[PDB]
Ligand binder design. Structure first.
Ligand code: BEF
Ligand SMILES: [Mg+2]
Length: 149
């Protein structure tokens, strides 16, 4: 399954995206798909803490410069299961950093399996926007749904 949490080679043109995944191969695969959809800029990192850092720094910079776009990333694809700080905790911390800027980055949970009851709960509590099977086959639909909302 894939959905909201309570060709296409120009599909993401104009867009800047962050891929977060502790697995080297998953990360490359995601960035590949996205580059194929015309993504203007893909950034990738290998942990929740790194993600947190890039987002924190990017929001501060954009605020300091009076940037037109205040979000450093139009979308973040967040792997759920990672050592140390998982995707839930990182997303929770990202939402807390965001409060002071009055913005909300779309964050899409990425996992190799459908969530159980506990993960599903964490999904909502963390403040993720959507959830995407790692095939990434539903990527464009999930983003359209986010955009409609
Ligand atoms: F390590 Be993940 F939640 F695909
Ligand atoms: Mg992982």
């Amino acid at each position: 399954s894939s959905g909201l949490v309570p060709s296409d080679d120009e599909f993401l043109r104009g867009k800047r995206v962050l891929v977060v995944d502790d697995n080297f191969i998953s990360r490359k695969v995601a960035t590949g798909k996205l580059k194929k959809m015309g993504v203007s800029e893909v950034e990738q990192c290998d942990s929740g803490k790194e993600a947190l850092r890039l987002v924190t720094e990017g929001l501060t910079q954009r605020e300091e410069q009076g940037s037109v776009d205040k979000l450093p990333f139009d979308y973040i694809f967040m792997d759920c299961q990672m050592p140390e700080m998982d995707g839930y905790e990182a997303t929770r911390e990202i939402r807390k950093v965001e409060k002071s800027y009055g913005v909300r980055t779309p964050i899409i949970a990425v996992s190799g399996h459908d969530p159980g009851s506990e993960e599903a709960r964490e999904t909502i509590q963390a403040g993720m926007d959507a959830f995407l099977d790692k095939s990434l086959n539903q990527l464009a639909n999930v983003i359209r749904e986010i955009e409609s909302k």
